[model samples]
Target chain A: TSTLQKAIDLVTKATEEDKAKNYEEALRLYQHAVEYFLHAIKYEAHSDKAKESIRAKCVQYLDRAEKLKDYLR
Target chain B: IELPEVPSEPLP
Candidate 1:
């Protein structure tokens, strides 16, 4: 469950950073969170059960990160 | 918003 926990922490922190309008910091954490999520998929059992849903959240963060990269453009 | 929302449930 630590993998899930770690991913959660990363995402939570990302959200906090984002709330302060720290887009760059948020992107870093969000991107790292995705890596942790992927780790969960590779190492956790019964991963497929909620795989799609979690993946959607990952994509959601990733997409936001991408948009953030262009926000100041 | 920088992100749509904080992940509810922090991922399953």
Candidate 2:
């Protein structure tokens, strides 16, 4: 049985990078979060709660990245 | 379609 991957690690890592002002690293980690969350949703369609949690995190990272876009250039 | 869970706390 394929178990669901834990997203806490990804979330933590991404948040840490964001906090450090490493927008590129944060962006990658955020993308990973989105991927894992998407995968989780695919594995457990009934897990609305889990899906929502992950999706929100993904959006949060994306939002943060967008906000930091100007800083990149 | 079931959507992903949205965390109650906003992202830091």
Candidate 3:
């Protein structure tokens, strides 16, 4: 739970960094968020619904990271 | 958008 919450917290900061145009930091944090989300999806989530939800969130962060990658390049 | 309130149901 705390680990999943950590992902949410990182995403919050990552979004703020993204809006600030700090693409590098935003990308790093978004990747970090995905890592935490994956950890939750694999081991933390207790229910199928929670796993699915976390997977969606993991993809969402992964998408953001990809966007940042394209922007950076 | 920044993360909205994560619903309790979606969380573990």
- List native contact recovery per candidate, as a fraction of 1: 0.06, 0.00, 0.06
> Tens digits of per-residue lDDT for model 2 on A22-45?
677876766666666667667766
Error of 1 at A8 (Å): 0.8
Q: How do these models rank on DockQ, best leading?
A: 2, 1, 3
Candidate 2 true-interface contact recovery: 0.00
Model 2 clashing residue pairs (backbone): A51-B4, A51-B5, A52-B4, A52-B5, A52-B6, A53-B5, A53-B6
Q: What is the DockQ of each candidate?
A: 0.09, 0.09, 0.07
Better of 1 and 2 by DockQ: 2
Which residue pairs in candidate 3 have backbone atoms (N, alpha carbon, C) closer than 3 angstroms, thus clashing? none
Q: Write model 1 residue lDDT over A1-73, tens digit each, in one string.
A: 5786788788889988887777778889988888887777778753355676568788887877777777644
Q: Estimate each model's TM-score.
A: 0.77, 0.60, 0.78
How well does candidate 3 score on lDDT at residue A64?
Answer: 67
Docking class of 2: incorrect
Answer with 2 or 3, whichever has the higher lDDT. 3
Better of 1 and 3 by TM-score: 3
Q: Is the docking of candidate 3 incorrect, acceptable, medium or high quality?
A: incorrect
